[PDB]
């Protein structure tokens, strides 16, 4: 239930950061899916996270590791 | 000083083309030099300051950084456009691709000078610069 | 519209033998009778037949285009053009094999042809054909969609889903405008994307454990449940490699159980493609010799099984196939280029060039076994004239095989020119044959046996009423065969007239003009399945770049349809 | 707010195609823009301008640059076009296939060379494709199978944005379902590229040594590694046994090329050394090179003109009835050396921007007209701009991949009234000129 | 037995005078050579237009011999598919000269550009400039190149020399740069001066000797003898490497061929 932060002054749009993110991949890659709501989606060459009430994200550090110019900050303490 | 170079693509670079050729998101993107740090220091060349980059080609004054993709010391980095063009050697080789990366270059540290605007670049080099 | 005086006629379809009939094209369409207003042809002492059909040559897509950029050796070559100069028609020709559109359009069109059936096309690269067929310039088109590897027919030929797999090859047809169903090499050019190949007839797929055996089998109860014009074209197993004769009749003996249902007349139920490429026999290249003998008389024996040759014309040429693993085998033999393109959930690809010279007993053997497949021929009909092009020749070559048909002295010479005569002689059968084909059973395994065999002689391939006004004369008299053979070779190279749907286009062989072309499809109706199109839709989301709604090729990229409609 | 699904952003190599643009009301400015990256956010947002370029401007006496109705710019071309001598057509990476067909034909009648980005970008590839061959695949293979990947003198991150979301490491295939886990990725240049930051190998190698470097890959996998000395272009003997190893052992590899091969020392050959490397690999496993093309259609030009002429690029269609090709002699930057041309025509490019200097130099001796969208480098020093159509925004079509496989895009704006398209400003330059009776 | 040709009106752009061969020029009138055809741009023009001929050609090309003097160095093409006979070029030249050659001589007496001597297949070339890149190159997208014949370069080389040659010979008497014999199957190339390196990649047999120092040795040679070779001059003591190994090797009689590279 963590918090992540998307720095968009250097955000590319790569959409590195969505196709990474294992609780997007829950819908489209889980045999009878739980939970079909997703934390990032790239509007207008950015990525925002829809996870506004730090609900979904499990701190895995799968989108911090994968976003190639670091831009994703994960906080890892109450928000 | 040989300092061998190359000249690539950045995703500012882009943005800044498709923004559009004469703005000036198009000059801070591509009026860079990316270069080592230990290079800078043994050169002489202040952190974001103009520096002539001299070939056998050309010359240009660009503005001496310092980028996040490590260049190994010896090595130089422009984003491609008007001002890597402008130094650019056109020996192709017999293929039609000019030596567009790994063309021996000078450089040589000199603030208090201008940069160049693309416009005033080209039309310059043809002889067209009407302002 | 126009009127065709004093030829004689050659019409297999209506057991036309040396007529001086006259045809009466009106707008398009042969009709009996038409008034004076009609410009006349003064074919006296012609040989006049149809437009010619093509069955299977690869004029067109992914892989021609990939040949065409690996080798502009093609083009030019010591100097000197190898495509020869000319500029007959309003653009270019260029290219010796694998010639540029505007070649392959004007070529056929000086040859007689005006049907030709691009053989092979994955699905997902439809409208690159679409496009290359708006540039071809006269001949009328039609592209054949490749669905023995599709990965959706591997699980519903696995499943045992008829009704699945019919709506999905309708599916597939409506979306790539195709004509008929190819199974490239059945289930091995899925194991090439691992790097292996299907050796025969029996062993599975990786992973899908499903086998050629049973693949073609479901495509077969498909098609002819479906009721396509075309039968399912089939290439084959263990291609290009001695003893396959075996594998070649295990392939064929899966037929023995359908017949031809459909509105159309069609007597095939599979259609077994260059099978001089399938007759070897023997274990290496060094005792290697020819099984014709007994692929034409299995052939002879089932009426239900129609055939082409693959005759091998002695020069030059890029083969390219849509299996990989033949063509990358032909690599690490002759140590020449070669060019793969892999599809995503569909087929292979490969381009190699290859020299077929007439100084190798290999090369020899492999030109005389095609003429043994069709001189042991007792029906026709069911045994057309391909290359193949251009694995096993560029089509300009056309009136060189028929030369080789028709004058056994031509046989002789090319057999006393080859320089292993001895041991082609010992390793085939060609040396010691009398048969020269006649004028009509040429003009029957040209015109009628495609056309017939495609399900659409009603139009093409025939001079009764009601059909395509596409008509070829030739400049041969039929009374007297030529004595040199060169004489049969210019004569059926350039023809003395050809007419498209009326229209005449080649004068002495010289273009006239270019109306334009249809490209035909099929246009099965039927009520869609909501399974099938629940997997399609699941399976593009997850496995296919493009998306669904830009696979199918827009109703304005192509360019003159004229469907072929079925029902149910 | 009228959703508009399955749009094609028209920027580089990648013609992605899952971009969904919210057009507003009246069907004539863009909203929000979804699932595309910045550069192709960007596109758009520039194609629905309000101030954009609506008719031709030609340069007066004065230096100034006045308008002209298309009409008067097509008579103005065509007879310029017949009166040259050797007229040079250049360009082609961004325009539909149409665009390239029609090019084709208008320099069919004039007589001139035709020519396209090939040449000063992976041209030298094509060059190596003539040699040695080219064992590719779809993007979609390697989506569903690729075990290993290697990005050699490429830089995806900053070139092509969403590949290695799509195509390459982070998509969840059929037969990959663990997704990147399973990937091995390599990535070779002198720099530490954002490319290297996201790989897991990283073979930092001296620039200009690639040669040498598949040199010892090759002698490798050929199986008597051990002759290789202890360094190798500043790589060392074990990183280049454990890549080796790993490309052994893959069960289905892919290779991506760019200007780290096709622009430096040994243009073509260091191209063709690694098409060699990859058809030996092919041996004991399943590879397949793919050059990262960069423009959405610059392998149009080469497939439309394989079909129309046989040469990918490189046209010598003076003679009127056969072509040639050679690109050391027919080339766009070696003919502009040479001062060998009399015309040049800017469609579909930035040939002042991105050519060398003294290139542009030598050409500017003669007229100059560009057929763009929008004020470019080569629209402010050429004779007459004749604006045109963009390619995916004001106008669809076909469109042709990193590999070949044809995309079709879509339509989202309508073009400002008067502005018409490449493909029916070409046809007319075609009549025009055959009015003239030439 | 002899042609002479002198330019007289300069031609703004290049000429392709393909048309000037012994094979052409032989047995002809001279208005007839004077009207050969040559191209020029989108332009066809008549070789009557653009040189002044004074001589007497032969009843063979093998005995004609065509002479050059002017200002040919904007030239293209000369000595195509020239089979037998002689020329002179008083000059320096342009691209293709020699090209696809069966026999005779050409005696460029200045430089080159590119493409000099492509797919020749015997006679001799006599060249003392520095003639440019792809000197003996194969056409592009061949795999059978140079069997034949012989290319003397008094200059400076370039690029691509010998790529995928077959036979034959190609000597430099000045130095080179990189991609010497790369693709080759067959000949001799003699390089007498400084190389920049790359030399004899993807070769699968052939030898490039060579005289003066490789500054890149690629990874793909072995040193295994020392060995005395007399090659355009006498005992020089080469020794020899072994093969491009990261190449596939022919094999012969019961012994793999390699494609070895010498050394001073
Ligand atoms: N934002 C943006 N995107 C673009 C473009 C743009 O201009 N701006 N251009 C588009 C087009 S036209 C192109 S062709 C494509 C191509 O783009 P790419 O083919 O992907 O190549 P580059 O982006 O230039 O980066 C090439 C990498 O090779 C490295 N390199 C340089 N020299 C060497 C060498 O000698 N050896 C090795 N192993 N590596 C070397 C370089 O450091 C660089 O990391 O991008 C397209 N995408
Ligand atoms: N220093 C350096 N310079 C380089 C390179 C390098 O590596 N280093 N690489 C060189 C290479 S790889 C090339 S690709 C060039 C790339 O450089 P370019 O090929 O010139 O690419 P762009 O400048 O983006 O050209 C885009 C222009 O085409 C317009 N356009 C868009 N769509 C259409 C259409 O449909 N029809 C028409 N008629 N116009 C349209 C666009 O508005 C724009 O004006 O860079 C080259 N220059
Ligand atoms: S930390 Fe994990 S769960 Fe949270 S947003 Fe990143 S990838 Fe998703
Ligand atoms: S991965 Fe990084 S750069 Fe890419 S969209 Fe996500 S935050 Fe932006
Ligand atoms: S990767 Fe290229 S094609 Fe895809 S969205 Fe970005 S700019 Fe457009
Ligand atoms: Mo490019
Ligand atoms: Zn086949
Ligand atoms: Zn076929």
Request: net charge negative; charged share 25%; aromatic share 8%.
């Amino acid at each position: 239930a963590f918090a992540v932060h998307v720095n968009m002054e250097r955000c590319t749009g790569c959409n590195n950061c969505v196709v990474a993110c294992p609780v997007n991949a829950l819908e489209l890659n889980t045999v009878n899916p739980s939970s079909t709501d997703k934390i990032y989606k790239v509007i207008n060459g950015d990525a925002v996270i829809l996870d506004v009430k730090h609900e979904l994200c499990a701190g895995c550090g799968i989108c911090v590791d994968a976003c190639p110019y670091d831009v994703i900050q994960l906080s890892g303490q109450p928000p | 000083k040989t300092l061998n170079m190359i000249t690539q693509r950045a995703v500012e670079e882009g943005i800044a083309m498709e923004i559009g050729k004469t703005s000036r998101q198009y000059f801070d993107a591509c009026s860079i030099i990316e270069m080592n740090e230990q290079d800078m220091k043994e050169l002489g060349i202040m952190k974001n300051t103009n520096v002539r980059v001299k070939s056998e080609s050309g010359e240009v004054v660009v503005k001496a950084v310092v980028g996040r993709q490590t260049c190994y010391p010896g090595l130089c980095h422009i984003r491609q456009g008007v001002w890597a063009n402008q130094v650019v050697p056109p020996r192709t080789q017999s293929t039609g691709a000019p030596q567009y990366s790994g063309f021996p270059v000078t450089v040589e540290p000199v603030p208090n000078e201008r940069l160049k605007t693309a416009l005033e670049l080209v039309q310059g080099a043809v002889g067209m610069w009407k302002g | 519209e126009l009127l065709i005086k004093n030829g004689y006629i050659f019409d297999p379809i209506s057991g036309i033998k040396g007529d001086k009939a006259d045809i009466a094209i009106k707008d398009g369409k042969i009709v009996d009778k038409v008034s004076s207003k009609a410009q006349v042809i003064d074919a006296s002492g012609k040989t006049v037949m149809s437009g010619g059909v093509d069955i299977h040559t690869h004029v067109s897509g992914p892989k021609v285009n990939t040949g065409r950029m690996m080798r502009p050796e093609d083009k030019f070559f010591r100097g000197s053009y190898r495509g020869g100069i000319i500029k007959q028609g309003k653009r270019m020709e260029m290219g010796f094999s694998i010639p540029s559109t505007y070649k392959t359009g004007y070529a056929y069109a000086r040859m007689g042809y005006t049907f030709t059936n691009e053989a092979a096309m994955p699905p997902l690269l439809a409208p690159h054909v679409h496009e290359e067929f708006r540039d071809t310039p006269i001949l009328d088109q039609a592209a054949m969609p490749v669905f023995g590897n599709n990965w959706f027919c591997f699980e519903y030929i696995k499943n045992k889903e008829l009704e699945n797999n019919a709506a999905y090859v309708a599916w597939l047809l409506n979306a790539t405008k195709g004509i008929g169903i190819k199974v490239v090499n059945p289930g091995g050019t899925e194991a090439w994307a691992w790097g292996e190949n299907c050796t025969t007839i029996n062993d599975p797929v990786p992973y899908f454990d499903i086998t050629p055996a049973e693949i073609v089998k479901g495509l077969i109860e498909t098609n002819e449940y479906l009721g396509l014009p075309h039968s399912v074209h089939i290439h084959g197993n263990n291609l290009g490699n001695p003893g396959n004769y075996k594998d070649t009749l295990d392939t064929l003996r899966l037929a023995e159980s359908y017949k031809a249902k459909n509105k159309f007349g069609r007597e095939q139920v599979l259609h077994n493609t260059h099978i001089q490429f399938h007759s070897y026999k023997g274990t290496s290249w060094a005792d290697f010799e020819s099984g014709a003998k007994e692929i034409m008389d299995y052939v002879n024996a089932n009426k239900n099984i129609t055939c082409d040759i693959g005759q091998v014309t002695l020069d030059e040429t890029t083969t390219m196939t849509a299996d990989g693993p033949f063509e990358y085998h032909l690599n690490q033999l002759n140590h020449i280029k070669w060019a793969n393109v892999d599809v995503e959930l569909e087929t292979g690809s490969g381009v190699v060039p290859y020299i077929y010279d007439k100084n190798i007993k290999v090369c020899g053997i492999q030109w005389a076994i095609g003429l043994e497949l069709a001189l042991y021929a007792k029906d026709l009909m069911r045994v057309h004239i391909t290359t193949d092009h251009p694995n096993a020749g560029p089509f300009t070559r056309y009136p060189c095989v028929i030369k080789w048909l028709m004058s056994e002295k031509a046989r002789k010479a090319t057999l006393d020119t080859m320089k292993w005569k001895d041991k082609v002689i010992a390793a085939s059968n060609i040396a010691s044959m009398d048969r020269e084909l006649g004028l009509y059973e040429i003009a029957m395994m040209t015109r009628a046996g495609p056309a017939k065999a495609l399900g659409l002689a009603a139009i093409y391939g025939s001079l009764v009423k009601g059909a395509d006004g596409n008509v070829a004369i030739y400049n041969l008299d039929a009374n007297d065969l030529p004595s040199d053979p060169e004489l049969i070779e210019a004569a059926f190279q350039n023809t003395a007239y050809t007419i498209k749907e009326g229209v005449v286009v080649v004068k002495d062989g010289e273009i006239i003009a270019e109306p334009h072309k249809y490209t035909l499809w099929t246009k099965v109706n039927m009520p869609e399945n909501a399974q099938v199109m629940h997997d399609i839709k699941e399976k593009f989301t997850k496995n296919y770049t493009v998306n669904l709604e830009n696979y199918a090729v827009f109703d304005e990229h192509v360019h003159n349809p004229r469907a072929i409609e079925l029902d149910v | 707010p009228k959703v508009i699904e399955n749009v094609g952003c028209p920027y580089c190599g990648c013609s992605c195609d899952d971009v969904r643009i919210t057009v507003s009301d009246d069907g004539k400015d863009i909203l929000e823009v979804e699932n595309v990256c910045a550069i192709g956010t960007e596109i758009f947002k520039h194609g629905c301008s309000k101030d954009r370029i609506r008719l031709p401007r030609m340069r007066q006496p004065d230096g100034s640059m006045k308008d002209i109705s298309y009409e008067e710019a097509i008579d103005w071309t065509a007879r310029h076009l017949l009166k040259a001598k050797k007229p040079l057509m250049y360009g082609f990476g961004s325009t539909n296939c149409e665009g390239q067909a029609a090019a084709a034909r208008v320099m069919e009648i004039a007589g001139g060379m035709l020519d396209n980005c090939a040449t000063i970008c992976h041209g030298p590839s094509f060059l190596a494709i003539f040699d040695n061959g080219y064992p590719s695949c779809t993007l979609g293979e390697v989506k569903n199978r690729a075990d290993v990947i290697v990005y050699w003198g490429s830089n995806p991150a900053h070139a092509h944005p969403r590949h290695m979301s799509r195509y390459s490491i982070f998509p969840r295939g059929f037969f990959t379902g663990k997704g990147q886990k399973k990937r091995t990725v390599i990535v070779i240049d002198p720099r530490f590229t954002d490319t290297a930051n996201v790989a897991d190998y990283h073979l930092q190698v001296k620039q200009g040594h690639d040669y040498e470097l598949f040199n010892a890959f090759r002698m490798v996998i050929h199986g008597h590694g051990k002759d290789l000395p202890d360094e190798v272009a500043g790589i060392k003997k074990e990183t280049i046994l454990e890549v080796a190893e790993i490309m052994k052992n893959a069960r289905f590899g892919t290779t991506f090329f760019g200007m780290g091969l096709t622009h430096t020392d040994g243009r073509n050959h260091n191209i063709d050394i690694a098409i060699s490397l990859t058809r030996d690999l092919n041996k004991i496993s399943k590879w397949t090179i793919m050059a990262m093309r960069g423009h959405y259609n610059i392998a149009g030009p080469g497939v439309v003109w394989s079909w129309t002429f046989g040469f990918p690029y490189c046209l010598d269609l003076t003679k009127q009835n056969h072509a040639h090709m050679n690109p050391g002699e027919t080339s766009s930057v070696d003919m502009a050396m040479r001062d060998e041309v009399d015309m040049f025509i800017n469609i579909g490019t930035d040939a002042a921007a991105h050519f060398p200097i003294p290139a542009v130099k030598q050409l500017k001796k003669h007229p100059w007209v560009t057929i763009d969208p929008s004020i470019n480098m080569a629209s402010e020093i050429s004779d007459l701009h004749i604006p045109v159509c963009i390619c995916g925004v004001d106008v669809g079509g076909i469109v042709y991949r990193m590999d070949n496989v044809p995309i079709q895009f879509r339509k989202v704006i309508e073009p400002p009234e008067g502005v018409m398209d490449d493909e029916t400003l070409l046809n007319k330059i075609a009549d025009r000129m055959e009015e003239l009776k030439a | 037995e002899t042609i002479t040709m002198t330019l007289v009106q300069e031609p703004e752009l290049f000429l392709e005078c393909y048309s000037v061969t012994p094979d052409l020029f032989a047995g002809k009138s001279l208005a007839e050579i004077a009207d050969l055809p040559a191209h020029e741009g989108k332009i066809q023009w008549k070789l009557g237009d653009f040189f002044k001929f004074e001589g007497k050609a032969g009843e063979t090309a093998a005995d004609t011999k065509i002479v050059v003097n002017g200002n040919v160095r904007r030239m293209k093409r000369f000595g195509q598919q020239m089979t037998a006979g002689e020329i002179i070029i008083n000059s320096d030249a342009d691209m293709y000269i020699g090209g696809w050659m069966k026999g005779g001589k050409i005696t460029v007496k200045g430089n080159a550009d590119s493409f000099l001597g492509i797919a020749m297949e015997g006679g001799e070339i006599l060249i003392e400039g520095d003639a440019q890149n792809h000197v003996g190159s194969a056409y592009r997208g061949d795999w059978r190149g140079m069997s034949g014949g012989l290319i003397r370069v008094k200059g400076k080389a370039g690029n691509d020399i010998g790529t995928a040659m077959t036979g034959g010979t190609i000597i430099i008497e000045g130095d080179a740069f990189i991609h010497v014999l790369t693709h080759a199957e067959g000949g001799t190339v003699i390089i007498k001066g400084d190389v920049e390196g790359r030399v004899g990649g993807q070769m699968v047999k052939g030898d490039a000797y060579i005289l003066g120092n490789l500054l890149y040795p690629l990874p793909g040679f072995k040193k295994v003898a020392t060995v005395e070779k007399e090659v355009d001059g006498a005992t020089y003591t080469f020794d020899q490497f072994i093969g491009d190994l990261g190449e596939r090797k022919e094999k012969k009689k019961g012994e793999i061929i390699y494609g070895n590279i010498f050394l001073k």
